[PDB]
Amino acid sequence: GGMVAMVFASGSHVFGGIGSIFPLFMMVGIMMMMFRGMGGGQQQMSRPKL
Amino acid sequence: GGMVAMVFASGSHVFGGIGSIFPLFMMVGIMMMMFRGMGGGQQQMSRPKL
Amino acid sequence: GGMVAMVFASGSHVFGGIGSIFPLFMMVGIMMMMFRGMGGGQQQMSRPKL
Amino acid sequence: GSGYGLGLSTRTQVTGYQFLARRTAMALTRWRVRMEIEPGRRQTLAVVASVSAALVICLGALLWSFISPSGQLN
Amino acid sequence: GSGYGLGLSTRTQVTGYQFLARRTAMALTRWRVRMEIEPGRRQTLAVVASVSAALVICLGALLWSFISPSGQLN
């Protein structure tokens, strides 16, 4: 969030409108990675083995 | 990388020093998550051993 | 960061490129010192399990 | 009987149903249930990869529009 | 005597004494030693936190002085 804010404060205004699609998708991609749950050496139970 | 490159074409050149610290450190966080994803080990199966 | 910001207000502007490599790398060492404190255990007794 | 209506459900039941759906789908086309290899999974995934590649190129085109536009006349 | 004088000491003897001090201190105010929870510890730490928060703001003010002193007029 700081990067988008830094660019706006600097006066670029490049991300206004459709340009905003980049930060939005990144935030979604970040959410997906940290939400996969536990997959370990003891926590072996997963779709490929069940 | 795409989000970073688009700012330079606008000529704002807000990065360097004060600005670069955000993308530089943020990049490390993504790598740090993929490492825990390939979690576990010691299985040791491989074509050369079989 | 305060030590860093204090130099820019003085106008020396010695940071960026060559100079910035010091505080950038220095930051990792502090973070490395805290994570070593993380090795206190590998177990959970969280409210969801109790 | 049991199971009717819009009751609650869990994540283990959702995968359980997808397993029976794939297995019965195989029985209609191959008339056998051994499933040593599961080709339905693979054939579906190939389409998902195709769609992903089309969108990735799609984002690549939008990225160049801002880097080197057609409006730079004069 | 056994413990008189000014001889050397070790790390385990330092915590050992502070434990006897906490247990006997609450015995003077609450008249019981069960010590389910040890509130003496928390009330003390709350003061330490207060002093630390004051030092942080105080130190924060000195940082502001260098970013914008009074002599930079016009």
Q: Output the structural class of chain D.
A: mainly alpha
Shape of chain D: elongated
The number of helical elements of chain A comes to 2
The total strand number of chain A stands at 0
Largest beta-sheet characterization of chain D? none
The proportion of residues forming helix of chain A, as a percent range, comes to: 40-55%
Largest sheet of chain A: none
Regarding quaternary structure, what we see is part of a larger assembly
Backbone CA Rg of chain D: 23 Å
Helix amount of chain D: 55-70%
Describe the fold and architecture:
Chains A, B, C: Part of the ESX-5 specialized secretion system, which is responsible for the secretion of EsxN and a number of PE_PGRS and PPE proteins, including PPE41. Chains A, B, C: This is ESX-5 secretion system protein EccC5. Chains A, B, C: It comes from Mycobacterium tuberculosis (strain ATCC 25618 / H37Rv). Chains A, B, C: Part of the ESX-5 / type VII secretion system (T7SS), which is composed of cytosolic and membrane components. The ESX-5 membrane complex is composed of EccB5, EccC5, EccD5 and EccE5. Chains A, B, C: It is found in: Cell inner membrane. This is part of a larger assembly, with 3 copies of chain A (50 residues) and 2 copies of chain D (74 residues). Chain A is an all-alpha fold and 50 residues long. Chain A is built from 2 helices and no strands. In chain A, 6% of the residues are buried. Chain D is mainly α and 74 residues long. Helices cover 66% and strands 0% of the residues of chain D. Chain D has 2 helices and no strands. The longest helix of chain D is centred in the C-terminal third of the chain and has 29 residues. The N and C termini of chain D lie far apart (77 Å). The relative contact order of chain D is 0.06. Chains in contact: A-B, A-D, B-C, B-D, C-E. At the A-B interface, helix 1 and helix 2 of A face helix 1 and helix 2 of B.
